[PDB]
Each structure stands twice: as structure tokens, then as C-alpha cells.
């Protein structure tokens, strides 16, 4: 079963996304928008040839933006938005006075570090509050590495130290960093939330990179201090160099290019360290690809990877954390996702967007297995699949797909879409039930596209060897300058649809309710119940039932040994159809949580493995 890439402990899958979208706010705020500017010059002027002036625009910022540098009366104030963000997921600062704190405060509320050596470390303690004004759970972020604007070098300065000292320090050293740092904080904040009938579970603690690195360190001392407090609270660490893992307290998600993310083994510094460290560990999302200008790049990565290599670090950037998983977290095809998913992430610029294909390239990584998810941005994207099964996601703007085979699905959001064959369109089989587009490839690789408006192929003649044709999709068929190409299907609707194949379809949609499908001698048939619970009559050979999504409970008759199973995108985490199989006297039943097929007067045993796509 399917938890969710930011499944944590024993949540429901809802509890966990909540918890995730809390602890990646906390965490954000902690910079109180610090890489504003960079955002902006990297979607404006990209991470190539304007470069020089992307790095610019990330120290002073622009009339839309706030760079490093504080002070400048055109730069908006980006401290601000930082706070109506973490204010609007639900959270406020509270203050060192409602703590009863002794400890350093700076004018925004921000929390400094207790002992010397940590004093550059930067904590945000939150609540939220009911519409009743009562508290109702408590967030600890910690900062990464940077300070507040106005000390931002010499705090920076500080941070590096810290960070070199968990590779390079005493063993213990990364995990005693939190306990160094807020101590007293930790358990001023402990008496707080138990004043207010909170409990340890009614805290999530968060933070980026070096806050990532503390997170981990408080879980690690949460069973021995502040009276065992916060041994069952929640953490949630984004890019740590370093994992706790003893006990399943912590989840440490970042991306696979992002060279801080898991430097370290556990906590110490290996021969990786230095280089790919794409080992994946159990606490870890090991195959999230942060899809950039640099990841794109071929020349850009002519260079060893490394974080010794500065243009590498592009993929550690905070408002790419932000951003790009919270768009992973609102998928489509979230409840599809597991921790260690291959989820490639669009992230380009505005240069590099409409030229540049995001693909699972698997650039210094281990070898991705299992189906791929790729997820669009708002913007127009050019979005490329490969031979494996894809879930690709365009989101708004006008997206254009291309995919290389297998079983997939593909979602083009709002917009104007295309999917794009690169073929001849006689290559492929395509029919359509009114709203979601059926692509079969030569090799018997199904393809299910909702929201696609145009069909593009690639056609050629003696003369001219590479030309793209658009086709309009429409009810009535594919429509060209050649005229309009009909579906060899027959189309049900909402209604319990009875429906008997003619001569020359190739297809059979219920659509939603409760359908009929019925066969026809020739076979070569594929039936598509789609939602509702369905009969499915197939008759004679090579039929294809084909099932996606919530599928409903169908019922399957006539199946015989030159016909196939095609699931794609349904419930379970298994590829082995035995996993899913039940005998029922001389019915088998494949089970798939709200959905199921029960295939009549048949035997498990009697199905070879080229009968059954789980996809
Ligand atoms: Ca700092
Ligand atoms: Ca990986
Ligand atoms: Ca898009
Ligand atoms: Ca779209
Ligand atoms: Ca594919
Ligand atoms: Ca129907
Ligand atoms: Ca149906
Ligand atoms: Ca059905």
C-alpha cells in the first residue's frame, strides 16, 4: 500500500501531507526570505550566459525583489512576505516574553544561540491557534546557514564553522549542535507547550540544511533530555548533511543533486562526502531530482559533482525546497508516491523553460527504478517521459508531452496541451472517451491522457523528411487539415451504459456508472469499464482489459490465455499480481483496495506473467 513520499511514522496519509506542509513553512521562514532576490535573477536571467547577472540581482534585489544586502529603500520588504507566508500556513511567532526566556532575541523574534560557539545559530519558535484563540500546536524551525541581513557576513561566518565541525569535528559534534545551541530554549519551550495541555506530539520541529542537520540533532537527543519532552514529536529535516535514524523519529527529505543533502554517513564524512553520495538511507527520500538549470546542463556538468564545487550548490537553495516540493506534495499523483519514488521536479528558469525537456537524465545518481514521476510547473512546459511507466503532471500553462513507452499517465492540467508522439501518426492507436486520450504503441504500451487538446505527430514524404502535424482533438474525433479522424470506439456516459461492440471498434468506454461491455467474435478488443462497477464480457482472442486510477469493482467474462490485464496507476505498492490474488470457488478476485476485478471461472494458476501489466 501507497503512503505518500512524505509518509511519516504511523500518520494517515492526510495527517503526514498537513504535517509536511507545516515543517516546510517553518522551515522556509527561518530564512525570513534571504534567497528572494536569487529567485528572482535565476527565473529572469537563468544559470548560463546570464549568470553574471542572476548573481547579481541575488545580492541587492531589484524594485520586485530583496537580495542579501538589507537597507536598499527599492527592494521590497521580503521580511514581510516572509511572515504573511508562515502567518497564512497557520503559524506566529512566539515571543521571548510568552516563553518567560531568558536567553537573546533579536527585534523579529528570532531565537540566538546559548553557548559560545553556537552563538550565530538561529531558531523560530511558532504556534497555531484555533478561530478561539487557543494554542493548539507548537513549531520549531531551526536556520540553515545565513543570519539576518544586517550581520549576514559575520553570521554566515560563524555557521560555516558549525558546518565544518560536523564533518570534520569531535563525533559527537553534529548531534550536541541543538543542545548547545538551545538548551535552555528547548525547555522553556517545553514548560510553555505543557502549560497550554500540549504534548510532545503536538510539536513539529523543522529546518533547512545546517537547520536541517539540528533537527536531526534534537531527535537525536529527545529520549535523554528535557524530561524525554519531545521523544515523540515530529521532525521533519529538509537537505541535512546528516540522518538520525535510530528509533524512526526523523524524515530527511531533499533532492538527489542537492550535494549537502546526506554528505554525511550517518554523521561522519567519507570518501563521498567529497563527491556523489547517492547511497540511499532509510530515513531519507533518496530519488527526488531537483530539475534545474544546472541538472539540465550538459556542460555545466563537464565538472566533477561535489560540494566542493559551488555551481552544485544551485540545488540546495531554500525557495527551490519551497517550492518545487510543496508542488510535489499538492501532485495529482501524490497518494501514488512512496519515500523512495523517482520524482523528477521541474525547476528551470524562464531562459531554459521553453527549449529544455525535463527528463529523468539520472545524472550522478544511483540507477532510478520503479515508475517515474514527473511534475510540471505553472508555467509551459516541455515535459519528456521515458521507456519505463511515467506519471506526468503539466499543472497550468500550455505544456507539451512527449513520452519514450511503456504505461502511462499523464495529466496536462489546465491550459492548452500537446502530446507529442515524435512519429508517424499511424503508429500508434488512438481512441478517446470524451475526455481522457488512449495511446497505444506498437509494442502494446498504453498511454492515458486527460486534458490534452492536441495530438502531435511527425510525418514525412519522399520529399520532406520532419514534418510536425497537429491534430485537434475533439469528441467527433482527430481533427487535421487531412479532415477528421474517428475513434473506432463505442462511447457510454454518466449512465449505466449498455454497450456491444461493433465490427471495427477497437475500444469499449463505460465512463462512469455501472456499464455493460460486451465483445465481439474477432476479439482484438479493449474493454475500459472506467469508473463505476462494470461487467466485462469479453469474447474470443487477444482482448485487453484495461483498468486505471479508482476503477471501481468489475466483473470479467471470458477471459482466456491470449487475453491481457493492464493496470496502471491503481492501488498497492506490489508489481507481483499474486499479491493482489484471492480464489473465490471458480472466481479469482484481484483486489485493489476500493477497486477490484473478479475474473469468473478462472484460476490464478492458468495466468502467464505476459498476461498482466501492473504499471
Ligand atoms: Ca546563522
Ligand atoms: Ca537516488
Ligand atoms: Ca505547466
Ligand atoms: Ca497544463
Ligand atoms: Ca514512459
Ligand atoms: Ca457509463
Ligand atoms: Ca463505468
Ligand atoms: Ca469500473
Request: glycine share 14%; aromatic share 10%.
Amino acid at each position: 500500500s501507497h503512503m505518500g513520499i512524505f509518509s511519516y511514522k504511523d500518520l494517515d496519509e492526510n495527517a503526514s501531507k498537513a504535517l509536511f506542509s507545516d515543517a516546510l513553512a517553518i522551515s522556509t521562514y527561518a530564512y525570513h526570505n534571504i534567497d528572494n532576490g536569487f529567485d528572482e535573477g535565476y527565473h529572469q536571467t537563468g544559470f548560463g550566459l546570464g549568470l553574471p547577472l542572476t548573481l547579481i540581482t541575488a545580492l541587492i534585489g531589484s524594485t520586485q525583489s530583496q537580495g542579501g544586502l538589507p537597507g536598499l529603500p527599492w527592494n521590497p520588504d521580503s521580511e514581510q512576505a516572509a511572515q504573511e507566508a508562515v502567518n497564512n500556513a497557520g503559524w506566529s511567532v512566539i515571543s521571548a516574553t510568552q516563553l518567560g526566556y531568558a536567553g537573546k532575541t533579536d527585534a523579529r523574534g528570532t531565537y540566538y544561540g546559548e553557548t559560545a560557539g553556537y552563538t550565530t545559530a538561529q531558531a523560530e519558535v511558532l504556534g497555531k491557534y484555533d478561530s478561539e484563540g487557543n494554542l493548539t500546536a507548537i513549531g520549531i524551525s531551526f536556520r540553515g546557514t545565513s543570519g539576518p541581513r544586517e550581520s549576514l557576513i559575520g553570521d554566515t561566518i560563524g555557521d560555516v564553522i558549525n558546518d565544518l565541525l560536523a564533518g570534520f569535528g569531535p563525533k559527537g559534534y553534529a548531534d550536541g549542535y541543538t543542545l548547545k545551541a538551545f538548551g535552555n530554549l528547548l525547555g522553556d519551550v517545553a514548560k510553555f507547550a505543557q502549560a497550554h495541555g500540549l504534548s510532545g506530539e503536538d510539536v513539529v520541529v523543522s529546518g533547512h540544511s545546517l537547520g536541517g542537520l539540528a533537527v536531526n540533532s534534537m531527535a537525536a537527543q529527545s529520549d535523554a533530555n528535557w524530561g524525554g519532552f519531545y521523544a515523540q514529536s515530529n521532525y521533519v529535516a529538509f537537505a541535512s548533511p546528516t540522518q538520525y535514524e535510530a528509533g524512526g523519529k526523523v524524515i530527511n527529505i531533499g533532492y538527489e543533486n542537492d550535494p549537502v543533502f546526506r554528505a554525511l554517513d550517518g554523521t561522519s564524512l567519507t570518501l563521498p562526502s567529497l563527491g556523489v553520495h547517492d547511497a540511499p538511507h532509510t530515513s531519507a527520500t533518496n530519488n527526488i531530482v531537483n530539475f534545474n538549470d544546472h541538472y539540465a546542463s550538459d556542460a555545466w556538468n563537464l565538472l566533477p559533482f561535489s560540494i566542493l564545487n559551488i555551481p552544485t550548490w544551485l540545488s540546495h537553495l531554500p525557495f527551490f525546497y519551497q517550492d518545487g516540493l510543496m508542488r510535489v506534495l499538492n501532485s495529482e499523483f501524490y497518494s501514488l508516491t512512496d519515500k523512495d519514488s523517482t520524482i523528477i521536479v521541474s525547476n528551470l528558469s524562464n531562459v531554459t523553460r521553453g527549449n529544455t525537456w525535463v527528463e529523468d537524465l539520472n545524472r550522478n545518481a544511483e540507477t532510478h527504478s520503479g515508475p517515474t514521476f514527473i511534475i510540471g510547473s505553472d508555467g509551459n512546459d516541455l515535459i519528456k517521459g521515458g521507456k519505463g511507466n511515467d506519471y506526468l503532471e503539466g499543472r497550468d500553462g500550455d505544456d507539451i508531452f512527449r513520452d519514450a513507452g511503456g504505461y502511462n499517465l499523464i495529466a496536462g492540467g489546465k491550459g492548452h496541451n500537446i502530446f507529442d508522439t515524435q512519429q508517424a501518426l499511424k503508429n500508434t492507436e488512438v481512441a478517446y472517451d470524451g475526455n481522457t486520450l488512449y495511446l497505444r504503441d506498437a509494442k502494446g504500451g498504453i498511454t492515458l491522457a486527460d486534458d490534452i487538446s492536441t495530438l502531435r505527430s511527425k510525418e514525412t514524404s519522399w520529399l520532406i523528411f520532419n514534418k510536425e502535424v497537429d491534430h485537434q482533438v475533439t469528441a467527433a474525433g482527430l481533427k487535421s487539415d487531412s479532415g477528421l479522424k474517428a475513434y473506432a470506439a463505442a462511447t457510454g456516459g454518466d449512465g449505466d451504459d449498455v454497450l456491444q461492440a461493433r465490427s471495427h471498434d477497437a475500444w469499449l468506454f463505460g465512463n462512469a456508472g455501472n456499464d455493460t461491455l460486451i465483445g465481439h467474435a474477432g476479439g482484438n478488443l479493449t474493454f475500459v469499464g472506467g469508473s463505476g462497477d462494470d461487467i466485462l464480457k469479453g469474447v474470443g482472442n487477444g482482448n485487453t482489459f484495461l483498468f486505471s486510477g479508482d476503477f471501481g469493482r468489475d466483473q470479467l467474462y471470458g477471459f482466456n490465455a491470449s487475453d491481457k490485464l493492464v493496470f496502471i496507476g491503481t492501488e498497492g505498492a506490489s508489481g507481483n499480481i499474486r499479491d493482489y490474488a484471492t480464489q473465490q470457488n471458480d472466481d479469482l478476485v484481484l483486489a485493489f483496495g476500493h477497486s477490484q476485478v473478479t475474473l469468473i471461472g478462472v484460476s490464478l494458476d492458468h495466468i502467464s506473467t505476459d498476461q498482466v501489466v501492473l504499471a
